[PDB]
Amino acid sequence: PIVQNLQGQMVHQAISPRTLNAWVKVVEEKAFSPEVIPMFSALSEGATPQDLNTMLNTVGGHQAAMQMLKETINEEAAEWDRLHPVHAGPIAPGQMREPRGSDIAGTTSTLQEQIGWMTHNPPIPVGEIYKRWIILGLNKIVRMYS
Numbered sequence: 729p730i731v732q733n734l735q736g737q738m739v740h741q742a743i744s745p746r747t748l749n750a751w752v753k754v755v756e757e758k759a760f761s762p763e764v765i766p767m768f769s770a771l772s773e774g775a776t777p778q779d780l781n782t783m784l785n786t787v788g789g790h791q792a793a794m795q796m797l798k799e800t801i802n803e804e805a806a807e808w809d810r811l812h813p814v815h816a817g818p819i820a821p822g823q824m825r826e827p828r829g830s831d832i833a834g835t836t837s838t839l840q841e842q843i844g845w846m847t848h849n850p851p852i853p854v855g856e857i858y859k860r861w862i863i864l865g866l867n868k869i870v871r872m873y874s
């Protein structure tokens with residue numbers, strides 16, 4: 729998550745062990761029943777893309793599910809890049825560079841870039857956008873196992 733430190737900066741804080749353990753538990757106890765979705769949605773409140781990847785990595789033992797998630801994230805990242813391609817050129821003062829799909833998914837963006845987008849005025853809500861992709865994937869998984 730993102731917190732404001734004593735010196736006034738917006739900085740990363742690790743996911744609460746309780747939040748992460750709750751996610752581990754839902755995946756281990758409920759497999760991919762429908763309740764995995766509202767649980768994911770609740771537990772990822774305020775999550776950066778880095779945080780979301782930390783959560784996704786606990787699903788690594790489930791190969792078919794992970795492959796479906798990866799495929800869905802890839803499709804959504806590709807559609808994002810088609811709709812919102814990065815414009816070549818310099819970044820204006822006070823502004824951020826445009827996020828690509830891989831930036832949203834946290835693979836090519838720094839934690840500071842993620843927080844910069846998420847806390848921008850107005851927000852460039854890369855956490856919410858990545859969440860949407862993951863929930864799309866989770867919906868496909870739930871449907872496959874239903």
